[PDB]
Design a protein around this ligand. Structure first.
Ligand SMILES: O=C(N1CCCCC1)N1CCCCC1
Ligand SMILES: O=C(N1CCCCC1)N1CCCCC1
Lengths: 164, 164
């Protein structure tokens, strides 16, 4: 059992789907579990796909950088889609050492312990329209290391202050 | 000819060197060529290592995000180490589509067409002291795809306004 990696770019280069389309496809095809680590999450289309997955019964765990968490909350509020009342979604925050906010500068999407998207694409409109980015689509043995890193992060994460 | 990937974390997890130490080691061991793509470059220790490599005769190509380029310039000025007068170093800028600055949100270090460090670690004091990050150390076939992506970026890069 080896590892397979494909690269995708924004803008696209020698592949048929954009990175956003690929994210949405990965989430749409999720059967069991989605584990997301993200620095900034404001993209409504991606959020919708994740909400939809959770309503099909997929367990969703999301870890967000604490210092940008309010941006995700604002988006969920605008959408009328409180994450606290969605029973298959858990959202927790992760921070670094303050000195200026210390941040979780890691992001990746893991689906079904089978496929990881790892790269520089953040879930914001600006990554669809403005920024250059790249990711890897990873399958096989290395996915297990992303599973373990997700668990490690999850263990260092907090309940967001807002949730009661 | 396959690909080998090791993961490193900051803070470290089950490896002896920090990511910064590993960056410095990679640069120290460079024999022929360093190709760096970086969003923000203010770390003086890393800069020093790169300057030193160039004085040994290693060709250095650096692509920086245009919107943060002034931070690198400021650092090189503070250090009294003008990059324009170092003959083995070329520095060019890359930007995305403006709307607010469109940015090159990609970073990686490629050394000798042999080893790539790819991940979320930016060359700034805050990644040594404050932020959580991770990278991959990549060798083997996938390095070739980073070579091609570097060339693609280089082809879309500009001479920084300051250089004349
Ligand atoms: O089931 C999981 N997974 C983590 C690894 C990838 C997906 C499966 N979790 C994460 C949160 C703590 C325990 C449950
Ligand atoms: O020699 C290179 N390299 C790029 C790929 C990795 C290292 C070698 N360059 C890059 C800039 C344009 C042509 C020369």
């Amino acid at each position: 059992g080896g590892t397979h990696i494909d690269l995708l770019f924004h803008p696209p280069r020698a592949h048929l789907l954009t990175i956003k389309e690929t994210i949405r496809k990965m989430i749409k095809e999720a059967r069991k579990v989605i584990a997301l680590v993200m620095d900034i999450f404001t993209d409504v289309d991606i959020f919708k796909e994740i909400v939809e997955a959770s309503t099909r019964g997929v367990s969703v765990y999301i870890l967000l950088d604490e210092s940008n968490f309010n941006h995700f909350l604002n988006m969920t509020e605008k959408q009328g889609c409180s994450v606290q009342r969605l029973r298959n979604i858990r959202v927790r925050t992760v921070k670094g050492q303050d000195y200026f906010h210390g941040k979780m500068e890691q992001k990746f999407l893991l689906v079904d312990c089978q496929k990881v998207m790892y790269g520089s694409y953040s879930y914001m409109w600006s990554f669809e329209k403005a920024h250059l980015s790249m990711v890897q689509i990873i399958t096989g043995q290395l996915v297990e290391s992303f599973d373990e890193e997700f668990r490690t992060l999850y263990a260092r994460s907090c309940v967001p202050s807002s949730f009661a």
